[PDB]
Structure formats: structure tokens, C-alpha cells
From a paper:
TgMyoA folds into an extended α helix with a characteristic kink between residues 801–803 (angle of 139° in complex 1 and 137° in complex 2). Clear additional electron density was visible only in the first EF hand of each complex and assigned to a calcium ion coordinated in a tetragonal bipyramidal geometry. In complex 2, calcium is similarly coordinated by the homologous side chain residues of D16, N18, D20, the carbonyl group of E22 and two water molecules. Complexes 1 and 2 are monomeric in solution, but while the calculated scattering data of complex 1 fit the experimental scattering data with a Χ2 = 1.26, the structure of complex 2 displays a higher Χ2 = 2.41, indicative of small structural differences in solution.
Proliferation and transmission of these obligate endoparasites in their host organisms rely on efficient cell invasion. Actin polymerization occurs between the plasma membrane (PM) and the inner membrane complex (IMC) whereas myosin A is part of the glideosome, which binds the essential light chains ELC and myosin light chain MLC1 (called myosin tail interacting protein, MTIP, in Plasmodium spp.). We demonstrate that ELCs bind to a conserved binding site on MyoA to induce its α-helical secondary structure and stiffen the MyoA neck.
Residue numbers in the entry:
A (entry chain C): 777 to 818
B (entry chain B): 67 to 211
C (entry chain A): 0 to 133
Write the structure that this text describes.
């Protein structure tokens, strides 16, 4: 299909946003880990 | 404004806080950066978001009362082992419980508030013995008081 | 006009580095490139099996130096601009995505479609929509 190069882009764009949505839920806790690491190194 | 303050009293003893503050206090004030260091030394784990919000609203030079407020805002009573471990387990595709050294480095130096290579190299000299790292064990170490 | 390119490249890389080891698999690299608005055939990505950020960025620089990929994306809509007036059928795109996208739920598709035809007019102004997303 000659739609396929188009929908492939739209779908990968939405997958990027799906990953962003899941990373947003975890990065606050990555940050907490980084802050405790910096506490430990003081 | 109160759960931060309750948590401060059950997480730090005020004698120690006052002693440290006056250790580095020059005329009853300390810089926000030195406040970050003092809060770490009192056993709390402020983030740089904490620091920048606090100085956004209260300025750059803290008297003891504003320092007390800042330390209050850095108590993070909601911290717990399971959430830190899920942070790391996000990248552990099989959830078996291990990350490699390269994974730990890239995660810690790429996301959130990335560590400098110096920060990470010190951390790793201590904890990243192997190439396979048990990140639940590492998170409990990191959370010990 | 370019530091934006590298910013989008670095974000796409970080989002598709699923196990956080600092490399993409070839397949993840394909999706990461497409996710920036760049049309890309699955067999036309000249990168190794494991892709570091430097190699990824380098491919991106060579790529966007040869055409504006957003304008190539816009050209992809043209065979389906049946009225030749700068729009395609909203329902046509909704159906094509239902038919061909396996990684997308119907909720995802309806969201994409209602951000593409917010006025519920039946038509998608695709140049405008493309520059809204990318
Ligand atoms: Ca990877
Ligand atoms: Cl991040």
C-alpha cells in the first residue's frame, strides 16, 4: 500500500508519545534516586 | 506547609540542624547551594528542582528560618523503596532484577537530573563492583539513613 | 533551525532506547527516525545492528541536509488529495490507520484524528496538520 509510508510515520510519532507518557511516570523517581545518590556522596 | 514540617521534626533533630547551619553561617545566612549541602549532611535528599523553586520564591541567601523551610521542602516523606526500584525496573526488560553497569551509567547520566561523570564514577567505585548489578539491593543501600 | 534537529534527535533516541543502555536496535532506530516526521523505508536505514547516539545523530544530519523531511511527509499525502485542494478525507485516514496500524488502539486513532480535524469538517489540511505534529 502507498499509504504505508505515511501511516508508518504517524504510528511511530504516536509510539514516541506513548514512550514519553511511560517515562514521565518514572523520571520523578529516577530523580529521587539521583538526589539520594548526591546525599550519599556528600 | 505542615506535613513538610511534621516530617522535618520526625526526620531531623533540630539541635543538629542549628549546629550545622551556624557552622557554615556567615552572619546568620547561608547560600542556597550550601543549603543543599547542609540538607544532604542532615540526611535529606533535595533535588535541584527543590532548590530552584525555593530560590525562585525566597531568593538566594537564607536565614535560619528560610533554611528550615527549605529543608522541610526536601523531606520527601513519600520516598519509598518500591518506587525507586520501579524507576530502575522500567529499563529491565525482563524484570529479572539486574541491570548492567553500562545500563546503570547511561540511566543515571541521561535521565532526570543527570549525574556528572565524576558523581557517577565515585558512585560506581563504591557500588558497581560487577557488570551485573542488583538494583533493588542498590536502592536499599541508597535509602538507608 | 538545526539545534532543534539535534534536540528532536536526542529526545527520539532517549524515548526508543527501551532498556536504557545507550544504544538503539536497528528496529528501534527505524521507529525513532520516523517518530521525528521523517519518512523511512524499513530496509533503507544505513546503520549497524546496534546504533549509538553519535551514529544516529550523524545519519540524521546527512538525512535532513538532503530534503526537508516534513515536506517529503507532506508530499506523501498528495496521491490522496483527490480534490487537489490541500486536504485529504478525515474518514479515509481514520480507516487506513485502523487497517494498517497494529500498535495503535482505536482510542489512539480517534485522538490523532480529532487533533487532525478539530472542527469535525471531514477534511484534513495536511500541511498545517503535519506542522502541528512535527
Ligand atoms: Ca537500548
Ligand atoms: Cl528525563
Amino acid at each position: 500500500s502507498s499509504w504505508e509510508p505515511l501511516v508508518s510515520v504517524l504510528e511511530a510519532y504516536y509510539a514516541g508519545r506513548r514512550h514519553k507518557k511511560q517515562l514521565l511516570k518514572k523520571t520523578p523517581f529516577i530523580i529521587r534516586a539521583q538526589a539520594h545518590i548526591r546525599r550519599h556522596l556528600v | 506547609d505542615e506535613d513538610m514540617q511534621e516530617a522535618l521534626e520526625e526526620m531531623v533533630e533540630a539541635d543538629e540542624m542549628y549546629a550545622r547551619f551556624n557552622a557554615r553561617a556567615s552572619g546568620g545566612k547561608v547560600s542556597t547551594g550550601d543549603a543543599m549541602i547542609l540538607a544532604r549532611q542532615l540526611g535529606l535528599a533535595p533535588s535541584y528542582a527543590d532548590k530552584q523553586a525555593f530560590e525562585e520564591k525566597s531568593g538566594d541567601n537564607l536565614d535560619y528560618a528560610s533554611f528550615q523551610k527549605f529543608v522541610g521542602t526536601s523531606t520527601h516523606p513519600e520516598d519509598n523503596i518500591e518506587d525507586l526500584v520501579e524507576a530502575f525496573a522500567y529499563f529491565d526488560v525482563s524484570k529479572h532484577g539486574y541491570l548492567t553497569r553500562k545500563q546503570m551509567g547511561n540511566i543515571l547520566m541521561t535521565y532526570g537530573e543527570p549525574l556528572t561523570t565524576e558523581e557517577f564514577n565515585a558512585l560506581a567505585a563504591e557500588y558497581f563492583t560487577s557488570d551485573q548489578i542488583d538494583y533493588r539491593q542498590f536502592c536499599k543501600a541508597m535509602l538507608e539513613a | 533551525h538545526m539545534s532543534s534537529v539535534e534536540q528532536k534527535a536526542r529526545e527520539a533516541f532517549k524515548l526508543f532506547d527501551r532498556n536504557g543502555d545507550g544504544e538503539l536496535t536497528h528496529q528501534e532506530a527505524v521507529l525513532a527516525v520516523r517518530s521525528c516526521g521523517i519518512p523511512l523505508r524499513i530496509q533503507e536505514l544505513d546503520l549497524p545492528e546496534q546504533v549509538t547516539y553519535p551514529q544516529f545523530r550523524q545519519w540524521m544530519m546527512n538525512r535532513v541536509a538532503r530534503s526537508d523531511p516534513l515536506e517529503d511527509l507532506i508530499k506523501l499525502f498528495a496521491p490522496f488529495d483527490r480534490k487537489n485542494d490541500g486536504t485529504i478525507s478525515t474518514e479515509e485516514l481514520a480507516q487506513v490507520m485502523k487497517t494498517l496500524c497494529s500498535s495503535m488502539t482505536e482510542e489512539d486513532i480517534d485522538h490523532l484524528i480529532k487533533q487532525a480535524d478539530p472542527n469535525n469538517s471531514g477534511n484534513i489540511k495536511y500541511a498545517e496538520f503535519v506542522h502541528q505534529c512535527f
